[PDB]
Design a protein around this ligand. Structure first.
Ligand SMILES: C[C@@H]1O[C@H](O)[C@@H](O)[C@H](O)[C@@H]1O
Ligand SMILES: C[C@@H]1O[C@H](O)[C@@H](O)[C@H](O)[C@@H]1O
Ligand SMILES: C[C@@H]1O[C@H](O)[C@@H](O)[C@H](O)[C@@H]1O
Ligand SMILES: C[C@@H]1O[C@H](O)[C@@H](O)[C@H](O)[C@@H]1O
Ligand SMILES: [Cl-]
Ligand SMILES: [Cl-]
Ligand SMILES: [Cl-]
Ligand SMILES: [Cl-]
Ligand SMILES: [Hg+2]
Ligand SMILES: [Hg+2]
Ligand SMILES: [Hg+2]
Ligand SMILES: [Hg+2]
Lengths: 312, 312
């Protein structure tokens, strides 16, 4: 057994670095603490132990994370909610982990809400633009809300009509161009877009089982977008945009059918041009990842350490 | 979500009482604490909350329980192991919960061992005879060991060759007549018997998937024996002895296929003539039970409350 909480939400980030791709994954342990596991290049994953706790959140708290490089160093922001369902934030300021200012704003989230976050613009010479998505209620038909950070936290828009506690995928395909993916009341995955002026319904759409966990990444000049969704104990689906949308297909391994456990969630990260990882929760309870190799394809990769309880 | 630990072992007991069948179920929460849920007659299950903690054990600790009536009242003994894998015991002495003497004996259990216990002879006028079964090592081919209580704890026999961490079902079919069921290295469920002089291989045998959880109950003059086994996410199997053995068959509901989660365990209790319950862990994470009605048959019954974490 491990210390990985069953049906823990997951959040993952990555960035290119001289000497190898850098990855960080966040997940919750049996005690409600948010842990971090790290990976540099192809080396084995490290961390994930009780020594890698960055903070705490309510049990089964939704999670989201973003990162960018700054003058101070690598910046990381992790979002989660406390026992009173108040949206909160952990900050890695380039050298240490502390608490962000978002908690003091007092934003209240629906107890079954998921979270998504995206960032664009942050660099050594520019301030980050962060957007966080969540829901206020758990009811069927609820909309998605947004909180914005551009110097200060302020409320953003609200849009859509979703299934209760829908999964939410969020990605910045370009400066100021945002794509949000969620599951509508009819169970179809829908897309919402922001190109400049307002939010409008995008053209993408696909049927999926009710309650899938959703993730989205993007890259390049085209730009390229990958939307992933998965119902626990079912196979992972991928929709790919490379100028236009293909037909969603499954990412699987014939020798390891439906490796995820029921009711679990996924997360995805990307960097370079192009590296992609999709994380899921499998028997163990273990934290696993599908890895992509341009040209070759998808394969289940290295297992992420999530601790070992005393007595084992 | 709930506070029921995923892949927690389960232990269950019951006894006939004027005014309705009494049941108690023991399971582990996210904090490693052993909780108790109770049921009287057909009324809804009660307990299972943080207020119903009877003790603590290592995370994912094996569990077993026995009960008998005495002059002092209802006697309950719960077995589990601590973080150093030392077999320990919680005692309900008729009015309160305390710690038993078995822990001080220092018996060390294999970390992946399961536990089984049986009792016979205890009443208002007679002392109980308790036997506890466990394994010392996790290796393939390991044997089963026994600890005996007849006035004092002393080591008993050792027998069999099993799959690593085999499930163990134990039952006293009559005074001094014991039946132990486990899974042998060939994956077949085997039976060991003690009628008076020594332990010998019983005639029962049945194929099963590797790693099934096993439970056994018995009653009457014949006597009647029921052996249950289940691989998580598969259907529950029952072998019945009513003088001779039938062919093992499945206990299922067409409208709710394989309701248990992967890698979970079961427990069973019985009382009267005859009431039977088989507990399993389902999505939720919830504690459920199959219930038997003589003549009518099996059905999934009431859900056992296992708490609600803060923030939900
Ligand atoms: C970006 C930073 O890299 C370091 O190696 C880690 O130890 C910190 O927690 C953080 O993830
Ligand atoms: C970019 C900003 O960095 C600060 O340190 C945080 O406290 C704010 O909430 C926001 O994340
Ligand atoms: C036999 C005893 O019955 C009581 O109602 C319970 O509260 C005790 O914990 C114990 O199970
Ligand atoms: C029957 C005996 O009751 C006592 O209270 C316990 O301390 C012993 O270990 C044993 O269970
Ligand atoms: Cl928090
Ligand atoms: Cl990058
Ligand atoms: Cl203990
Ligand atoms: Cl009885
Ligand atoms: Hg938090
Ligand atoms: Hg669009
Ligand atoms: Hg214990
Ligand atoms: Hg026998």
């Amino acid at each position: 057994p491990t210390e990985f909480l069953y049906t823990s939400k997951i959040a993952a980030i990555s960035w290119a670095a001289t000497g190898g791709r850098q990855q960080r994954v966040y997940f919750q342990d049996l005690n409600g603490k948010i842990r971090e596991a790290q990976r540099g290049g192809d080396n084995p994953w490290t961390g994930g132990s009780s020594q890698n706790v960055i903070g705490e959140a309510k049990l089964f708290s939704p999670l989201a994370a973003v990162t960018w490089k700054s003058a101070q160093g690598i910046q990381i922001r992790v979002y989660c909610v406390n026992k009173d369902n108040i949206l909160s934030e952990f900050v890695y300021d380039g050298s240490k982990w502390i608490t962000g200012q978002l908690g003091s704003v007092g934003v209240k989230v629906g107890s079954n809400s998921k979270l998504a976050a995206l960032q664009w613009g942050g660099s050594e010479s520019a301030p980050p633009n962060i957007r966080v998505y969540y829901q206020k209620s758990n009811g069927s038909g609820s909309s998605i809300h947004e909180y914005v950070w551009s110097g200060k936290w302020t409320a953003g828009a609200s849009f859509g009509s979703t299934v209760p506690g829908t999964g939410i995928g969020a990605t910045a395909i370009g400066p100021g161009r945002l794509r949000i993916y969620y599951q509508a009341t009819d169970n179809k995955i829908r897309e919402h877009c922001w190109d400049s002026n307002s939010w409008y319904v995008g053209g993408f759409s696909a049927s999926a089982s009710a309650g899938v966990s959703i993730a989205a990444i993007s890259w390049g000049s085209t730009p390229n977008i990958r939307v992933y969704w998965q119902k626990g104990r079912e196979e992972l689906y991928e929709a790919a945009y490379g100028g236009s949308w293909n037909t969603p297909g499954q990412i699987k391994d014939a020798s390891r059918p439906t490796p995820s456990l029921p009711d679990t969630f996924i997360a995805a990260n990307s960097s370079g041009n192009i590296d992609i990882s999709v994380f899921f929760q499998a028997s163990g309870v273990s934290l696993q990842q599908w890895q992509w190799i341009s040209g070759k394809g998808w394969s289940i990769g290295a297992v992420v350490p999530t601790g070992t309880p005393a007595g084992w």
